[PDB]
Amino acid sequence: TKIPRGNGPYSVGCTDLMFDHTNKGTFLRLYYPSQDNDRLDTLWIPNKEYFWGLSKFLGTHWLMGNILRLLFGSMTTPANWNSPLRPGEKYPLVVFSHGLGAFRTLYSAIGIDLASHGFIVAAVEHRDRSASATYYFKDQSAAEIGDKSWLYLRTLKQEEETHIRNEQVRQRAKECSQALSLILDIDHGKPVKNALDLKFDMEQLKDSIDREKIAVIGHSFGGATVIQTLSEDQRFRCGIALDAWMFPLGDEVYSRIPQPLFFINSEYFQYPANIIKMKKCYSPDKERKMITIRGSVHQNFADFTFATGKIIGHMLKLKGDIDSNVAIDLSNKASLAFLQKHLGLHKDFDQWDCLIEGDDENLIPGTNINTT
Ligand SMILES: *[P@](C)(=O)O[C@@H](C)C(C)(C)C
16 A cells, blocks of 8 residues: 555554444544554455445446446555554544545545554544445444445535535534544443444543543545534634635634634645635634645545556646655644644644744745735
8 A cells, every 4th residue: 555654653553433323323433543563454445335436426437436446445554453452541532524525534644644643533424425425224233234324425406505515514513523422422431332343342442532632633525524613512622624625614603713723725726715714714812824735736635645656646636746645744744733732732743833834845834825
C-alpha cells in the first residue's frame, strides 16, 4: 500500500464498531494506539458494495464498480487489524466526519497518523445518504448472521439541494454527537454488544478516554459537519475543517460556535462563495485560523490521493502539484499543533506551531481568495 504509515511513536490498531445494529445506531471505524505492532493488515475498502456505491457516485455503471474492486479490493492500510489497545493511559479523542460520496474507511492516512501520536480516532459512517454506501441490520438476528441492509448515496435534483443538504448536515452533527456519546458511555462501563463480530473486545475501551480532550475533524461535507457539530455540542472542545464545503450550513450557525476552529484548505478547491462563509465565522472574541496547502487539490485530504501513480493521479484530480505525502504531513502536523494548543496536550506538537500561521514554503497563511 502507498497509504503512509503514521509518523508518531505509537503503533496503530484498527477495528470497527456498530451499536446499536439499526439504521439509527452509530457505525464507526476506530484507529487507536495499539499494544503491539505485529502486521499492517487492515483492509482499506472492506466490502464489494462500497465499490458499487463509488461507481454510482461517479456516475458510472456496473463495470466501473468491478474495475475498482479488481484494482483496490485487496489493498491494505497500515494499521494492525483488531490489535489490543495500548494500556495504561487516557487518550484524547477525535471524531472524524467523511465527505460526500465517501465512507468511514477513506481517511485512514489522517486517522492512522493521529493514532500514531496518541489519539483514539472514531471515523463515523453517516446514514444520511451522503455516503457512497453504508449498511445496518434490520434486527439482532440479521446482525448475528451478517445479513446486511445496504443504503446508497441519494442523488439530488437542483431544487432539492438547499433543503436536503441542510437536513443532512443536521443529521451528520447528530451522528457525530451520538458517536461521541457511545464512546464516552463505553469509557464509563456501558455494556455494549458490537453488532459486528470482531476479535477486538470493546471492554478494553473502559477508562481509556481523556474526556476533556475531544475534537471533531472532517473533510468537505465533513468540514461543514465540524461546524454544525461544534454549534450543537460543547463536549467537542475544538474543530478542524479540512477543505470545508460550506453550502449546507444555515445562517444561524455562524454566531453559535464558541470553540476554536481551524480551516485547512487546498489551493485548488476553494472559491469566493465558499470562503466568504468561512470568513463569517471570524470574530475578535473567537479563535479562527486558516491555512492553504500550496499545490493541493480537494482529494489530497482523502486516501484516494495514495491509490494511483503520479501521472494518472494528477489526470484524475486525485493528486495536485504537491507531493501527496508532503501535503498530508503538513495537514497532519498543523492539526497536531492546533489540537495540542486547544486541548491542552502535554506533547511536543507545539514544534509545529508555525504551521498554524502558514509559515512553510508549501503553505499560504489564510487563503488565495481575498474576498472581503
Ligand atoms: P466534498 C464535495 O463533500 O468531498 C468529496 C468530493 C469527497 C472527497 C469524495 C468526500
